Short mmCIF file of C-alpha atoms and ligand atoms in Angstrom, two decimals:
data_model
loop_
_atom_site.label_atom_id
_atom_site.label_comp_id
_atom_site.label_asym_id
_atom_site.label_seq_id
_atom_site.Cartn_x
_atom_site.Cartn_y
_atom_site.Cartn_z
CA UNK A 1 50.55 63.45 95.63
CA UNK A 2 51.85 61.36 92.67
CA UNK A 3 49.27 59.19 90.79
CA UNK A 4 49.48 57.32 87.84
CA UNK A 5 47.01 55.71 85.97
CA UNK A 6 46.72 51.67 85.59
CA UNK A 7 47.51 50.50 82.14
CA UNK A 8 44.98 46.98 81.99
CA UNK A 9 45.45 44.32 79.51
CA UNK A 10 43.75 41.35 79.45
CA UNK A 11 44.70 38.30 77.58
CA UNK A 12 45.48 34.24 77.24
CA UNK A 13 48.80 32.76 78.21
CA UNK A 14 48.08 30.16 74.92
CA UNK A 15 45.96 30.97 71.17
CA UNK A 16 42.40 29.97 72.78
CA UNK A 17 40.44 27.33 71.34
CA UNK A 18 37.02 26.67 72.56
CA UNK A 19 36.70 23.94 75.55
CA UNK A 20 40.79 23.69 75.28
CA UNK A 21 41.83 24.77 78.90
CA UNK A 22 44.06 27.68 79.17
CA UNK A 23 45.22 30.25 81.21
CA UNK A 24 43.16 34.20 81.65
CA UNK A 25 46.04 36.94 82.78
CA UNK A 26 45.02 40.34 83.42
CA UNK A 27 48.32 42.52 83.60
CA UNK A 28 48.14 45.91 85.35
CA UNK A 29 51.33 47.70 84.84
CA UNK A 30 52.14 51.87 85.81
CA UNK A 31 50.34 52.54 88.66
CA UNK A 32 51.02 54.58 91.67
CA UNK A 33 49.86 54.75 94.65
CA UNK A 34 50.20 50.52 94.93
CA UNK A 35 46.49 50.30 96.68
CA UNK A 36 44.45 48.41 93.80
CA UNK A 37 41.39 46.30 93.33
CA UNK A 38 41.77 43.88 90.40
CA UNK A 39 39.28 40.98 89.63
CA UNK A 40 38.82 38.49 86.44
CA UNK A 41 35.24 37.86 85.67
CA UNK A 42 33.06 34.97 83.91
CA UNK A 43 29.90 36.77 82.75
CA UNK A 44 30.10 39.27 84.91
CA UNK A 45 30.94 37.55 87.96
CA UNK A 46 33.98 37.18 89.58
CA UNK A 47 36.50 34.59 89.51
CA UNK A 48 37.51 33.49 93.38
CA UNK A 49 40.00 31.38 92.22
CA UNK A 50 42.65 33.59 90.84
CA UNK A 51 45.75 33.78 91.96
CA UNK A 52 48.44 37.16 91.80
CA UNK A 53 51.87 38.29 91.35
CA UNK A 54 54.51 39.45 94.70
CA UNK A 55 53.78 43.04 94.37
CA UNK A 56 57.10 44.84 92.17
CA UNK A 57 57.49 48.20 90.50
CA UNK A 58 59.57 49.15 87.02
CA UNK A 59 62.59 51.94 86.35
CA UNK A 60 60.26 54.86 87.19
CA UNK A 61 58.67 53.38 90.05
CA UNK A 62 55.12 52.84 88.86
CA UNK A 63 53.88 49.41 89.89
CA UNK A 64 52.91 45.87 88.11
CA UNK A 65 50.49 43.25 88.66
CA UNK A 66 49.63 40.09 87.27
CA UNK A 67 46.28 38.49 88.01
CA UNK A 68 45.91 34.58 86.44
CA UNK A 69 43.65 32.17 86.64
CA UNK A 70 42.81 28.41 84.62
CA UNK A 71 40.03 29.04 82.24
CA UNK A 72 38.04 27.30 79.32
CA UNK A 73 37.46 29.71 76.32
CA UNK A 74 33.96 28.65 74.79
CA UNK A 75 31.91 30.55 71.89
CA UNK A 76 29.58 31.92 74.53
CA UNK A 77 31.46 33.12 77.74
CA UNK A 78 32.17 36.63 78.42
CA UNK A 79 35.78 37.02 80.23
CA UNK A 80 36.86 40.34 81.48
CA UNK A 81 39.22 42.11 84.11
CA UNK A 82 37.61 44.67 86.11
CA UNK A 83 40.43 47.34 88.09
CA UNK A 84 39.97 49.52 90.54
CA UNK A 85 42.57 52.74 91.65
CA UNK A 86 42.48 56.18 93.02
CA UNK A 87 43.17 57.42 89.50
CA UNK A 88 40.00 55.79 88.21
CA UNK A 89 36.37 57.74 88.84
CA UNK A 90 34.64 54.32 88.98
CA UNK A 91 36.05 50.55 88.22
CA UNK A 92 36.99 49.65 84.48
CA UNK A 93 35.78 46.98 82.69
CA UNK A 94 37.86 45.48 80.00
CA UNK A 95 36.64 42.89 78.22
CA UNK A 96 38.86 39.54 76.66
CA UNK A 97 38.67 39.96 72.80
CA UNK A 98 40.74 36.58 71.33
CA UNK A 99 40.38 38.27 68.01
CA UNK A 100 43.07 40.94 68.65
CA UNK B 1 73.70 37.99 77.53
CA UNK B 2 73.31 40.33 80.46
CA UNK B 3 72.05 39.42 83.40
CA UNK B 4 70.75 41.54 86.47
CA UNK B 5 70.15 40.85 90.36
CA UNK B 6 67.77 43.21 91.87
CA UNK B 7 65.48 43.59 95.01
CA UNK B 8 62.26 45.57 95.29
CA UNK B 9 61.05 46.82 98.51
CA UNK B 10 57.72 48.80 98.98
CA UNK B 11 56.51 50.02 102.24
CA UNK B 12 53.44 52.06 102.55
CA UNK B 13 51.95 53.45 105.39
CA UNK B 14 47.79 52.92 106.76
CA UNK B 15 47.75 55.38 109.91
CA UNK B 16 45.28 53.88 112.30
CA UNK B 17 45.18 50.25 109.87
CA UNK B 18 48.14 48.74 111.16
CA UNK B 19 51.98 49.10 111.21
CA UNK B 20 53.57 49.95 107.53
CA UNK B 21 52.79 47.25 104.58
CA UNK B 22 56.16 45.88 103.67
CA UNK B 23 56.94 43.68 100.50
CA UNK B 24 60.11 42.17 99.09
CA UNK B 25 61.02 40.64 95.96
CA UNK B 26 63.89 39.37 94.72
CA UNK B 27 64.32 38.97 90.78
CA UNK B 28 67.23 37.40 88.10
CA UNK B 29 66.87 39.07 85.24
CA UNK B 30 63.40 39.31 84.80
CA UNK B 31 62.20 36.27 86.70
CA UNK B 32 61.29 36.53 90.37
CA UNK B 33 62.64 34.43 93.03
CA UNK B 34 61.51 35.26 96.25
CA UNK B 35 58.79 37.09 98.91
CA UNK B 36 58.27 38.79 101.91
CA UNK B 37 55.05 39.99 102.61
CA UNK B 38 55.11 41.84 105.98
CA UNK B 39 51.25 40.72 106.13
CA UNK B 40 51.05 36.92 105.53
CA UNK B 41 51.06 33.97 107.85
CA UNK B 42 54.44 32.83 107.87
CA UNK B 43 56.89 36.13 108.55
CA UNK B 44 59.39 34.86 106.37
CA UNK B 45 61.44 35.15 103.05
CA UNK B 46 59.86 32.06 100.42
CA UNK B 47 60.55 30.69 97.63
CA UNK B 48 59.25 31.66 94.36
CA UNK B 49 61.56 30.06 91.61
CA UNK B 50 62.45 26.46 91.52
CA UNK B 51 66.24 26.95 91.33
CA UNK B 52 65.95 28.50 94.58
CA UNK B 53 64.10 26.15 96.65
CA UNK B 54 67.09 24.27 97.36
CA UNK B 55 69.05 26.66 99.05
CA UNK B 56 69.64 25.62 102.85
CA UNK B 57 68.22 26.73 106.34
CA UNK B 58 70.95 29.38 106.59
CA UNK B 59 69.80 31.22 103.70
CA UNK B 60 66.82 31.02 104.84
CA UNK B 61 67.11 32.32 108.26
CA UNK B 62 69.36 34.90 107.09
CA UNK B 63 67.35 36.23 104.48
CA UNK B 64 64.29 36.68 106.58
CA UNK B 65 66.35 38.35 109.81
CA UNK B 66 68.02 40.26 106.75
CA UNK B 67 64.87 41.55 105.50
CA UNK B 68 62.72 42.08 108.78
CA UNK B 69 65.52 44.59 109.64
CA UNK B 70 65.28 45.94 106.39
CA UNK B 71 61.19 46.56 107.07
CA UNK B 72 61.58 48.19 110.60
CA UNK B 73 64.07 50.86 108.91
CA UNK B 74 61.68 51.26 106.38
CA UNK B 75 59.11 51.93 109.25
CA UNK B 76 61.12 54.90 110.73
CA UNK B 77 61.62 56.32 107.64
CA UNK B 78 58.06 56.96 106.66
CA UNK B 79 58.05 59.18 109.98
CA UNK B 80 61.56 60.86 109.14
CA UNK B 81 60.07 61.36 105.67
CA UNK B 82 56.75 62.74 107.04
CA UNK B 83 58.52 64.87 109.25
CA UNK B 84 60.78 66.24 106.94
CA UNK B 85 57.93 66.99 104.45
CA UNK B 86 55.54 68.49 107.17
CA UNK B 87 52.88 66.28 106.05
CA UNK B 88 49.71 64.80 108.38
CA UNK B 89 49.90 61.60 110.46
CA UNK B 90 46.40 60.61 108.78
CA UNK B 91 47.76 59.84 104.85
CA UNK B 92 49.39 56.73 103.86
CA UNK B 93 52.46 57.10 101.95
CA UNK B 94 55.37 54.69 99.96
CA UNK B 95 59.11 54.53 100.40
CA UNK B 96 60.47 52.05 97.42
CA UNK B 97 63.75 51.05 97.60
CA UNK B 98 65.69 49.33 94.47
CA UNK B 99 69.47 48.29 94.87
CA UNK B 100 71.39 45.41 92.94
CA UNK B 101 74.48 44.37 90.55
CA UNK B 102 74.44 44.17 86.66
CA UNK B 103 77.12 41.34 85.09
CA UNK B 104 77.54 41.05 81.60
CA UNK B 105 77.70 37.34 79.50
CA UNK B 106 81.17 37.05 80.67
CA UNK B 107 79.66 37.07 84.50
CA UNK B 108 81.94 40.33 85.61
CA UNK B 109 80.68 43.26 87.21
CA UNK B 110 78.99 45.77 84.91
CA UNK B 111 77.21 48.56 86.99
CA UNK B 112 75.46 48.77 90.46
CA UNK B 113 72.40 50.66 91.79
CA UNK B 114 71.26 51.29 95.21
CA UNK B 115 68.14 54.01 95.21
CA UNK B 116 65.18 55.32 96.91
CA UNK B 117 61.63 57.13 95.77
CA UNK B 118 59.18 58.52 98.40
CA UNK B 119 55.21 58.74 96.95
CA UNK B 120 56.35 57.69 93.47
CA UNK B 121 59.26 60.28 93.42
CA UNK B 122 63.20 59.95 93.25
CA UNK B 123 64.35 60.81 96.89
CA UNK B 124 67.95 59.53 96.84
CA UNK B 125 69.92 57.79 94.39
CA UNK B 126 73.68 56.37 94.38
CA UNK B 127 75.81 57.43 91.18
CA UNK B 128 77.20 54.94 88.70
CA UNK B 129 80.52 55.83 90.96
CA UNK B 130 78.89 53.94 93.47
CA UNK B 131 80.59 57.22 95.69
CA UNK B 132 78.36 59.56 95.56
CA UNK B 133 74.78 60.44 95.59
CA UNK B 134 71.97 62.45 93.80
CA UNK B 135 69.46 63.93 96.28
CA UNK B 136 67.14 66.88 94.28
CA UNK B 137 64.87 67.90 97.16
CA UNK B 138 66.20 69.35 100.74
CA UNK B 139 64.97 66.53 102.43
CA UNK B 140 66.82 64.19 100.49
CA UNK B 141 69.93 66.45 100.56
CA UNK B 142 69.41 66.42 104.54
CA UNK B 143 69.53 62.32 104.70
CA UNK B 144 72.72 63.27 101.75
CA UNK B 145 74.84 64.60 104.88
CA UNK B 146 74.07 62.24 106.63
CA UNK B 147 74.87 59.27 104.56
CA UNK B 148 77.99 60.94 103.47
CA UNK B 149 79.18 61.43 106.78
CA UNK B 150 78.29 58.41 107.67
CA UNK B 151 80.04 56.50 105.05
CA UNK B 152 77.53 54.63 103.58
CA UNK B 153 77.95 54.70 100.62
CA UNK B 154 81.65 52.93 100.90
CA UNK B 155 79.65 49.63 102.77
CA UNK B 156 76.74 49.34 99.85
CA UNK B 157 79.77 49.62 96.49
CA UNK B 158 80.93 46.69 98.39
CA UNK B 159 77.80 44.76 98.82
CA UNK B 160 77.81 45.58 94.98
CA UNK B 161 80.88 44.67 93.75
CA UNK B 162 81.38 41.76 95.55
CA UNK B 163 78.75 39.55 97.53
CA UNK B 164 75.62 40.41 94.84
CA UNK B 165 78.14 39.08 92.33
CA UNK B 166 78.52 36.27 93.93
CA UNK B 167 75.04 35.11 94.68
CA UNK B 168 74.03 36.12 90.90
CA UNK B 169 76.23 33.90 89.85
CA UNK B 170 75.52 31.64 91.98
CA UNK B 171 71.32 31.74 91.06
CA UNK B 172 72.04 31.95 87.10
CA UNK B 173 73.95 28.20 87.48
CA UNK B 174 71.77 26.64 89.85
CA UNK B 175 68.61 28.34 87.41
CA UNK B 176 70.85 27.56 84.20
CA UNK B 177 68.33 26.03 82.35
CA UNK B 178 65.65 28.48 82.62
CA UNK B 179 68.02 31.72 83.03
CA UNK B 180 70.43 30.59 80.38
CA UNK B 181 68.26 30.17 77.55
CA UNK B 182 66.79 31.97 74.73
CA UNK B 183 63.39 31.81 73.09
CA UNK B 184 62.98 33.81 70.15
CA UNK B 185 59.35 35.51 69.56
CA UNK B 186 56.93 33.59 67.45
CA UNK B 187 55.88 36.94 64.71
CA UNK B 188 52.87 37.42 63.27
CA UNK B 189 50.50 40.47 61.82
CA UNK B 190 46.66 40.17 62.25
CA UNK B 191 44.63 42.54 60.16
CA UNK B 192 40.91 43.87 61.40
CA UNK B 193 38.38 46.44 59.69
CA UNK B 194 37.49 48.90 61.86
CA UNK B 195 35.07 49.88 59.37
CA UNK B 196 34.40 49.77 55.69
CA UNK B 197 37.86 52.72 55.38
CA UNK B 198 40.24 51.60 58.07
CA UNK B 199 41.74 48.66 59.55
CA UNK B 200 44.04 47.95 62.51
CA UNK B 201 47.23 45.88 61.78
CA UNK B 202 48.53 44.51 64.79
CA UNK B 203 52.07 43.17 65.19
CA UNK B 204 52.84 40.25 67.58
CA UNK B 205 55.78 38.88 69.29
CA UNK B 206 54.57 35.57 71.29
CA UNK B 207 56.57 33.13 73.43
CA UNK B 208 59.73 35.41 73.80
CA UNK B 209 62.85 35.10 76.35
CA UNK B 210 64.06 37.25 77.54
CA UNK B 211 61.82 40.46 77.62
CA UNK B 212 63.88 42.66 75.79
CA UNK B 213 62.28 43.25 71.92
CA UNK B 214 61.66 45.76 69.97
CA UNK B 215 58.78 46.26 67.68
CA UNK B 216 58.30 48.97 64.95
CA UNK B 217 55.83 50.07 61.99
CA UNK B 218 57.11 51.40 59.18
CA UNK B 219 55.00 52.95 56.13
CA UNK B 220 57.07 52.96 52.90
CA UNK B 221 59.78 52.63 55.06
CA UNK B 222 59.14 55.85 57.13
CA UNK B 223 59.03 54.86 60.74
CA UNK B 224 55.50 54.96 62.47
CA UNK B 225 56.46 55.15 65.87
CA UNK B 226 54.71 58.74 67.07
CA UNK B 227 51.44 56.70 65.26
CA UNK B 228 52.00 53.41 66.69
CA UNK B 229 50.04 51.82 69.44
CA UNK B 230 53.05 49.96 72.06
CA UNK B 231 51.46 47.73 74.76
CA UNK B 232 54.30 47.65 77.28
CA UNK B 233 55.51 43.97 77.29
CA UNK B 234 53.65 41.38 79.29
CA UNK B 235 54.56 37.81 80.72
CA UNK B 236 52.20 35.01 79.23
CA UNK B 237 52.19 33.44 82.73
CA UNK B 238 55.00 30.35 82.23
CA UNK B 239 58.29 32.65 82.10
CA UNK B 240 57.60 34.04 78.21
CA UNK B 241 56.57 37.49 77.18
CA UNK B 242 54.72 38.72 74.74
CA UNK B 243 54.24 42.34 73.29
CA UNK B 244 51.81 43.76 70.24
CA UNK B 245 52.32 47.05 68.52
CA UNK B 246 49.28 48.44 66.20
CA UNK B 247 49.09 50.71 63.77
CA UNK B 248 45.18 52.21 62.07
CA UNK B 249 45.96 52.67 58.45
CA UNK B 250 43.29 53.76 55.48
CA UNK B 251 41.44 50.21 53.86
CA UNK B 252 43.74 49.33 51.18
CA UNK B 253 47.07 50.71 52.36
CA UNK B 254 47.92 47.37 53.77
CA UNK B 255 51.07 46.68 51.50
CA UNK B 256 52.79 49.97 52.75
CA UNK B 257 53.45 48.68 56.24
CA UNK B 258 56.51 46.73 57.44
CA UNK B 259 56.43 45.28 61.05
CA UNK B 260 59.77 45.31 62.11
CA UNK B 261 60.83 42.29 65.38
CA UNK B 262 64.58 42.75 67.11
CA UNK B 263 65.41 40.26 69.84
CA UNK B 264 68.54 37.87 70.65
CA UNK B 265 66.76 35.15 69.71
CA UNK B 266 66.64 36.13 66.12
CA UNK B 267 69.87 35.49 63.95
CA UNK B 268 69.11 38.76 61.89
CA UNK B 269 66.43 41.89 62.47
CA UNK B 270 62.84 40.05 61.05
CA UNK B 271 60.60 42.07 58.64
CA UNK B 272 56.87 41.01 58.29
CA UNK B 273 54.73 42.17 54.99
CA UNK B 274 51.52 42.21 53.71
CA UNK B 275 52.23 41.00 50.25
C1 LIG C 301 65.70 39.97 101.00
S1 LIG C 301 66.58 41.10 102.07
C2 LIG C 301 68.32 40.65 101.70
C3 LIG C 301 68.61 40.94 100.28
C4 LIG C 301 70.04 40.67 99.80
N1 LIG C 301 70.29 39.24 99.68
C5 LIG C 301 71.11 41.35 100.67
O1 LIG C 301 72.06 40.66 101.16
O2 LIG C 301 71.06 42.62 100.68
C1 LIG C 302 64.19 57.13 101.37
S1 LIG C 302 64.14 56.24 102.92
C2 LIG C 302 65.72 56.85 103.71
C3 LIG C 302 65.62 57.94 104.82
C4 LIG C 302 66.85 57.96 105.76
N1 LIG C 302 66.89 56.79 106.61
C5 LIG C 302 66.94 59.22 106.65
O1 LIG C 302 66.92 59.08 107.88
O2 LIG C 302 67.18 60.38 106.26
CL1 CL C 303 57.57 55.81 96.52
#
């Protein structure tokens, strides 16, 4: 069967400032089959709040994704966006870097 | 500008986990406007833009009996598609189905598209003719005769032409203040050593409408694009986009590279230097 690989990014919706409430997205776009396990973490830990996207698919019929949820950037909290697919020998990890 | 109406089905199959999964979205261009989700509470079509929520209980009603039918065909095609393919009652598979109307800035019919992948392929597709289909594999040349005989193709040209149209036009007046607009992309370049002999330049596009942009590198005015690092183009989460395109270039080099923004919010083509 088909397969294709998610392509993860994981960013603000706003330039972060520290204690200056924003919004965490983690965008998962190009995947096939559309079975996929995507969570937003805070140190490690997942985020039960957050909230997804009505499931949709591009030209070439890979699939897209957006996870969101409100979040405080500080100096010392780790965000991240942790995906799981078929295509993928274990879950990926990728962490927030506001520096990018 | 151009403006597009399009619905997204996906139906997958989970033998033995229930009957087929079955989503629907509709979109405007590229912001959504409504759900099904064949698995949720209510069983029918919602809202998800503004501009829409004030359609009537007609639309309503006849959106939801419109797409129910649409996920019970769906359902019998994952076993004429199984079937057809010889393939074992125990996997889950996907039909997708895509079909809507183009209109350029003068609100006239451009193009139409009515199409079909099984498992992440192109099955069957309907010709810019809007007469006449492509179908590469037997199967889908099998469904081909039957659709041709059947005359299908003559009902959907008509949904296409006229009644999607209608309702885009509709959706981009009632939604004229968020579909109408354009916000050009906030540039910038951010510079980061990689170590003490290379950096990564990184060119930004923030708070953009619509999606379409283009972003290149050039080096001395050579375009970089086979060395250039695209992330496809996201949405910021309030109906902007943003994209970033990064190039790794030798500590000191800076000066050669040109980041290069296009989108119809710009007056003229933008240039960013290091200077
Ligand atoms: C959401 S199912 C109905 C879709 C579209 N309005 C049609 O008439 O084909
Ligand atoms: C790609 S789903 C369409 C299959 C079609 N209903 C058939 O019976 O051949
Ligand atoms: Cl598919």
């Amino acid at each position: 069967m088909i397969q294709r690989t998610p392509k993860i990014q994981v960013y603000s919706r706003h330039p972060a400032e520290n204690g200056k409430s924003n919004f965490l997205n983690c965008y998962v776009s190009g995947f096939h089959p559309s079975d996929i396990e995507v969570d937003l973490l805070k140190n490690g830990e997942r985020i039960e709040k957050v909230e997804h996207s009505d499931l949709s698919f591009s030209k070439d019929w890979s699939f897209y994704l957006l996870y969101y949820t409100e979040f405080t950037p500080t100096e010392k909290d780790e965000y991240a966006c942790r995906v799981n697919h078929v295509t993928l020998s274990q879950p990926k990890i990728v962490k927030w870097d506001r520096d990018m | 500008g151009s403006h597009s109406m399009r619905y997204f089905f996906t139906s997958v199959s989970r033998p033995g986990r229930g009957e087929p999964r079955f989503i629907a979205v509709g979109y405007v261009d590229d912001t959504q406007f409504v759900r099904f989700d064949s698995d949720a509470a209510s069983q029918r079509m919602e809202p998800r833009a503004p501009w829409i929520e004030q359609e009537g209980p007609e639309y309503w009603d006849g959106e939801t009996r419109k797409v129910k039918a649409h996920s019970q065909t769906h359902r019998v095609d994952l076993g004429t598609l199984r079937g057809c393919y010889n393939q074992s009652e125990a996997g889950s598979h996907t039909v997708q189905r895509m079909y809507g109307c183009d209109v350029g800035s003068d609100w006239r019919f451009l193009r139409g598209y009515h199409q079909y992948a099984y498992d992440g392929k192109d099955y069957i597709a309907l010709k810019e003719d809007l007469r006449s289909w492509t179908a590469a594999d037997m199967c889908a040349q099998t469904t081909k005769h039957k659709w041709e005989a059947a005359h299908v193709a003559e009902q959907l040209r008509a949904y296409l032409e006229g009644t999607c149209v209608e309702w885009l036009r509709r959706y981009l007046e009632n939604g004229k203040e968020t579909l109408q607009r354009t916000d050009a992309p906030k540039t910038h370049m951010t510079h980061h050593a990689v170590s003490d002999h290379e950096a990564t330049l990184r060119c930004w596009a923030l708070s953009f409408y619509p999606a379409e942009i283009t972003l290149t590198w050039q080096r001395d005015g050579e375009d970089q694009t086979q060395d250039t690092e695209l992330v496809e183009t996201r949405p910021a989460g309030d109906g902007t986009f943003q994209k970033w395109v990064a190039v790794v270039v030798p500590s000191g080099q800076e000066q050669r590279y040109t980041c290069h923004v296009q989108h119809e919010g710009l007056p003229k083509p933008l240039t960013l230097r290091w200077e």
